[PDB]
Amino acid sequence: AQVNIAPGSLDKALNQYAAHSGFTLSVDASLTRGKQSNGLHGDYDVESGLQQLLDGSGLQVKPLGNNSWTLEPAPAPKEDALTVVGDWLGDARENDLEHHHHHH
Prior knowledge:
Elements lengths: L1 E3 L5 H12 L2 E2 L3 H4 L8 E3 L2 H8 L5 E5 L4 E6 L31
Parallel strand pairs: 2-5
Antiparallel strand pairs: 1-3, 4-5
Helix pairs in contact: 1-3
């Protein structure tokens, strides 16, 4: 199922995919409020697409009752540091300025 969601908000990206799937999800938004998540792009089911959204930290998803799933902290290897981002093209222009000294 082709699902394209724009990032810039974890809470949003959640409702976006959650609405496309049709299931319930219970996750501690306490920590969520303040961070963002990677949107989706391509044919991905409820689970496939869901894992693609939070994809980046690696967590576990398990159901609770009917069709309600939750996200919990799972074990991971010794985290590392990714390369440092470079810069953009920056094709702007600059204007000259005038300044003269004065006496008493």
